[PDB]
Amino acid sequence: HHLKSINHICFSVRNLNDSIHFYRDILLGKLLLTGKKTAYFELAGLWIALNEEKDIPRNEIHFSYTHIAFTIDDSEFKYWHQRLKDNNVNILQSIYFTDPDGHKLELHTGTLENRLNYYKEAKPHMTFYK
Amino acid sequence: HHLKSINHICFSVRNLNDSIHFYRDILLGKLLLTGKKTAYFELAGLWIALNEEKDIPRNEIHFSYTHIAFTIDDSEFKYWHQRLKDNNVNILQSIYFTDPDGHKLELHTGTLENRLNYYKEAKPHMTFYK
Known about the structure:
Chain A has 3 helices and 8 strands. By secondary structure, chain A is an alpha/beta fold. Chain A has a single domain (about 1-125), classed as 2,3-Dihydroxybiphenyl 1,2-Dioxygenase, domain 1, CATH 3.10.180.10. Chain A has a 4-stranded mixed beta sheet with strand order 1-4-3-2, covered by helices on one side. Chain A is globular, with a radius of gyration of 17 Å. Strand 1 (about 5-15) of chain A pairs antiparallel with strand 5 of chain B. Chains A, B: Its cofactor is Mg(2+). Chains A, B: It is found in: Cytoplasm. Chains A, B: Homodimer.
């Protein structure tokens, strides 16, 4: 009875139209549905749901404790960096950035296996499980 | 140049040992690595990274604006509800719950296609995109 797969991700956003431009044009996702306060995309094979909450305060820090990373090919790194820079995205083997509200996102060019093998060399006092 | 897939998710957590018990025993994920302040799992085919931040305030609301849903078979609904209840998990076609810190999670038994077809009947004033 294991969990089978990731099903979807949902984010609260302040302005649906700004978020549709981000997810669908900048990140090249597919818009599937809208309501007055909702939008669904398919991005990288993943269902993403957006819920508009116009009152999330803009003068406070939110979204600090989660990040979501998507896979790109290594060869596409400069393409994506330039695309995000040319669209004035907030940019902080990985590109770290935020959506228009501040949800933390990452583009990464490696696998979990790559990362484990990297840490076995770089951080050998970690404990690795079979 | 589309994004290829979801790569991983990272969460900040206050107590690594409490979170390892949650992700690995209660949710049946696989522990792959630990450090003093890090743990990696594979859960539902997804790399999840945990970063321990012992100072996230316990007396404030956090994690409000994101949720992550995992797929289960319809027939496993009562199994999972009972498993989470019997492990004193905070429970709020879906089961809504939190991890020990408050990260919002969901078990869902349907697909995006199912949901679109549901809304075409239940919420017919939404706009549906081909």
